[model samples]
Target chain A: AYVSDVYCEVCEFLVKEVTKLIDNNKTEKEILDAFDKMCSKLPKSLSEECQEVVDTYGSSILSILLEEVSPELVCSMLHLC
Target chain B: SDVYCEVCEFLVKEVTKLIDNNKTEKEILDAFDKMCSKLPKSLSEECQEVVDTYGSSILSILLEEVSPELVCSMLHLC
Candidate 1:
């Protein structure tokens, strides 16, 4: 019984929830505002997790980002934390 | 939907306890491995006891049914 479904609902639902916001009109302001709300609500525990995760993966990611990412784009991303 | 919030609260408290005590993922995996090796014991059915106690998202990383690197990253909040 190797029955399988490639597109799991859990995966699709997560994407769909976010995709709808992007699909709506005036995506830039909408996405930015929504993200600001989310960022403001980020918990202290999760912030610690973010630090742990960065410590774990940051060097590898930063190396690639330095090569392929623009300073402006990097600055945009860095604003989140 | 009717899952006990006590269970949920206990869940958070224990993980926070782990973090507070500086418990490592290695220790967690060791317990999970023991749990797996002792299947059908009162606390080992479906691997649910360890899953419940250890947090499903954490243990799900080791579960064969889970696939996708991003999924594991998402689960760990990475």
Candidate 2:
């Protein structure tokens, strides 16, 4: 895959999805549960790859969402910008 | 397209039935794991992939909505 292809898209998609999940007023446990739930709903390869991203950046993303930062800031922090 | 969706629909139906029968989450997941392990290697991998990808949340999704089309659609298998 190209450098930005998988990673950037994953970061952006996750940021968007989790951000929306958080907007539903989920607590931390429910929020992380929802995140894994969302990843599980993805296609097989993408879902597996999503978990790798979770291992690397999941906590940061959760923290960012909890802090109520703009979603794009996640992409920026991940250097997907 | 057709096969994946068919498999997905089948899983959704069977899993839904298990829930309706009051099966525990561990039992349901074990059923999937054992079933996958018993298939031909290629099919076993395929089945396990589905289990791994969807196992954790299938219950809640089934509880919230039991639509095969919706579940398969969410996985982009339909």
Candidate 3:
């Protein structure tokens, strides 16, 4: 369950911090730059059933950051998402 | 890069603390669950998309029907 717990929190934190940026109206560079740290924090593993949740929900957050969230802002803003 | 990795290490130290006690996995997860539950939830709808995405991702872990690998691709890296 380590994976289930940690990975999910990782995304949850990202959403929280990035939401701060959006609310504060940070610069594109600031917004994009923050994600670099986001990527760095992603864990290396998860639980058996946990892996399934990580795989599914994890991918969606990445996609939203990369495909929807990023693009919604600037294509390159979330380039590393 | 602070938001960078502020979360990366969030539970590590607590984990180290809890691991020494040898609590149940669910118990430790409950601690993490406590930490996660208090996370910020004020993003605007546009920004909330990723949050929802993540909530969904977290949902996958909480649910019993999802599978791994096929479930995750590159997101596995971060």
Q: In lDDT terms, which candidate is top? A: 2
Tens digit per residue, CA lDDT, model 1, A7-79: 2322332222222222223323332343334334557654444344334432232122112323222222323
Q: Compared with the true structure, what per-residue lDDT tens digits does model 2 show for residues A1-81?
A: 586665566455444443333333233344345456656887896676555544554444433323343445555554654
Order by DockQ, highest first? 3, 1, 2
Q: Which residue pairs does candidate 3 place in steric collision?
A: A3-A46, A37-B4, A53-B61, A55-B71, A57-B57, B1-B4
lDDT tens readout by residue for model 1, B1-78? 112222222222222232223233334434443545566665456444433443423222222222223332333422
lDDT of 3 at B2: 31
Q: Which candidate do you rate higher for TM-score, 2 or 3?
A: 2
Off by over 4 Å in 2: A1-81, B1-23, B66-78
For residues B1-78, could you state the per-residue lDDT of candidate 2 as single tens digits? Answer: 565565455444543443444344454555555755776879777666755654444333333344666655655667
Model 3 per-residue lDDT tens digits across residues B4-69 = 122323322222232233233233233343344555555344334544444333322222221222
What's the TM-score of chain A alone for every prediction? 0.28, 0.43, 0.30
Candidate lDDT (C-alpha), each: 0.32, 0.50, 0.33
Query: iRMS values in order, in angstroms?
Result: 18.9, 16.8, 15.2
Docking class of 3: incorrect
